[PDB]
């Protein structure tokens, strides 16, 4: 059992990830206004995953799911150099809360498809993940439309449940 949240910007593939983790296929997904949950069942831990869409009118309501959260997924796009700043703003906005203080971080460099897509390292330092405090943050470069690195992030995450 683990409460999982999939936060991030819009068009992040986060529902593309979620139905790849639960089902295994890339379903044609609308821009999800509300949220999503599928209990992904993997590595002796049932990951209860609260995927929530990342459009503008939703981001204030993000605080309502930050309770009993054992772990984050802050999905980033590797193909959004223009939005990495507000994502870095979002991250520094969101992590700084007393609620959601003991949940580790697993960042997905989604949409590794282009030379526009960066690696984990540049995305780490554009976000400044070394500036974090009280964090088991761990970026994990993933390809949602091919399942690549997805189970490996879940692998790292399942290590990070027990102590």
């Amino acid at each position: 059992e683990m409460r999982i949240l999939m936060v991030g910007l819009d068009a992040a593939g986060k529902t593309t990830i979620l139905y790849k983790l639960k089902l295994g296929e890339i379903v044609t997904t609308i821009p999800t206004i509300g949220f999503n949950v599928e209990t992904v069942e993997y590595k002796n831990i049932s990951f209860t995953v609260w995927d929530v869409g990342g459009l503008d009118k939703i981001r204030p309501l993000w605080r309502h799911y930050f309770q009993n959260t054992q772990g984050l997924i802050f999905v980033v796009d590797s193909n959004d150099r223009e939005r990495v700043n507000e994502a870095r703003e979002e991250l520094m906005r969101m992590l700084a809360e007393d609620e959601l203080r003991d949940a580790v971080l697993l960042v997905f460099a989604n949409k590794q498809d282009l030379p526009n897509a960066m690696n984990a390292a540049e995305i780490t330092d554009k976000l400044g993940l070394h500036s974090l405090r009280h964090r088991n943050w761990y970026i994990q470069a993933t390809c949602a439309t091919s399942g690549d690195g997805l189970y490996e992030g879940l692998d790292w995450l399942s290590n990070q449940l027990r102590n």
Binding site: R63, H64, Y65, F66, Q67, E97, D98, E99
Partner: protein
């Protein structure tokens, strides 16, 4: 000055009705409760209502509304003191006073209404002497009813002669959020339990400051009574002269005197509490309880009531000594400690959660009230010196006393 004293319920139907002048109509009572619905829901609640020219003096019992109605410029404290007396006399008769006490015992209660008051004028309200000719089980009225001594019948006889006193302290406290004591007075009250033969005149003396000042012992231990309110039976003209507590007691349990005084010394137990109210998240109460009072003394069964938020949830308590019960029904915690001696200082660390959604409205800040009780311990330092038993027959009674210190209003204003 009453005309028609009524008893209502929580619904507003008449439990019992009794007029004394006829100057207030009996159907006026049906407007009271909607006006009571009116004044409360607009916050204009007062113990006096008015439907035109009928004035509605009422108190509120557990279920009951002892509504005394009048029309003229009646004496107000005349009414309400009688109202609590009728509650008291019913409490003297009926060990609980509810709707079952009225509708099952209308045989005696209408007779009480005939007896306690005529026309609006209370004439006989001492229940102990009232038991002798108003029974729920009739002879002539007693002479004590006629007598100026109206609290103690003659011929009362026991095998033993026991005078049981209860010098009871009640510590008021107002500590603000600043941590300063705003108002800490002590209202002590000596309540007597007399089991004596005949008609004795008891004469009491304490460690009065003024009586020691009249004696010349105003350098030793002397409590300073800022005001006392006594029983009727205390001859206050004799007390006004030379601090003389001289009286003929009634028989049984009664409060003789009610002293009140301020005290500029520390509270017996200092509380330090904190609030880590995290918005949408949680709250933490690292509360300690140090005992400032005497180490020989022990605060029995203390019950620290700390108001928690209403939607507070997932309680966690790291105590040191003493258990917590979380009372969401009062939206609070009772960190209860049975034995808590003087000098002791016990911490409790509370932890709740908080909903990630906010609530709709505010809640306000109730203070923290604890329920301490320390026996054999006068904080004001009052000491009964003697008790002169004076009987014409002449006997050696057994005067007895114990000292108990409790809280009065032990409020400590929170963050």
């Amino acid at each position: 000055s009453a005309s028609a004293v009524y008893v209502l319920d929580l619904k507003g139907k008449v439990l019992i009705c009794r007029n004394y002048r006829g100057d207030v109509d009996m159907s006026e009572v049906e407007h009271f409760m909607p006006i009571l619905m009116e004044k409360e829901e607009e916050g204009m609640l007062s113990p006096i209502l008015a439907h035109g020219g009928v004035r509605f003096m009422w108190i509120k019992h557990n279920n009951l509304y002892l509504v005394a109605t009048s029309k003229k410029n009646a004496c107000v404290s005349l009414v309400f003191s009688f109202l609590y007396k009728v509650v008291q006399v019913f409490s003297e008769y009926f060990k609980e006073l509810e709707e079952e006490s009225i509708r099952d015992n209308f045989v005696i209660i209408y007779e009480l209404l005939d007896e306690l008051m005529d026309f609006g004028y209370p004439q006989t309200t001492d229940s102990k002497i009232l038991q002798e000719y108003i029974t729920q089980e009739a002879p002539r009225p007693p002479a004590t009813v006629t007598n100026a001594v109206s609290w103690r019948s003659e011929g009362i006889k026991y095998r033993k002669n026991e005078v049981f006193l209860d010098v009871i302290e009640a510590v008021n406290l107002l500590v603000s959020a600043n941590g300063n004591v705003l108002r800490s007075e002590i209202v002590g009250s000596i309540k007597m339990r007399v089991f004596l033969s005949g008609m004795p005149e008891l004469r009491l003396g304490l460690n009065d400051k003024v009586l020691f000042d009249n004696t010349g012992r105003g350098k030793s231990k002397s409590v300073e009574l800022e005001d006392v309110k006594f029983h009727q039976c205390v001859r206050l003209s004799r007390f006004e002269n030379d601090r003389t507590i001289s009286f003929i007691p009634p028989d049984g349990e009664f409060e003789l005197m009610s002293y009140r005084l301020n005290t500029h010394v520390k509270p017996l137990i200092w509380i330090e509490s904190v609030i880590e109210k995290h918005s949408h998240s949680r709250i933490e109460y690292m509360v300690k309880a140090k005992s400032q009072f005497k180490r020989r003394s022990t605060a029995n069964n203390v019950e620290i009531h700390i108001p928690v938020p209403n939607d507070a949830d997932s309680p966690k308590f790291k105590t040191t000594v003493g258990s917590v019960k979380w009372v969401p029904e009062n939206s609070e915690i009772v960190w209860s400690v049975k034995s808590f001696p003087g000098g002791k200082e016990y911490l409790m660390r509370a932890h709740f959660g908080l909903p990630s959604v906010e609530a709709e409205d505010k809640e306000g800040k109730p203070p923290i009230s604890v329920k301490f009780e320390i026996p054999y311990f006068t904080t004001s330092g009052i000491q009964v010196r003697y008790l002169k038993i004076i009987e014409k027959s002449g006997y050696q009674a057994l005067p007895w006393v114990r000292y108990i210190t409790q809280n009065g209003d032990y409020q400590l204003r929170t963050q």
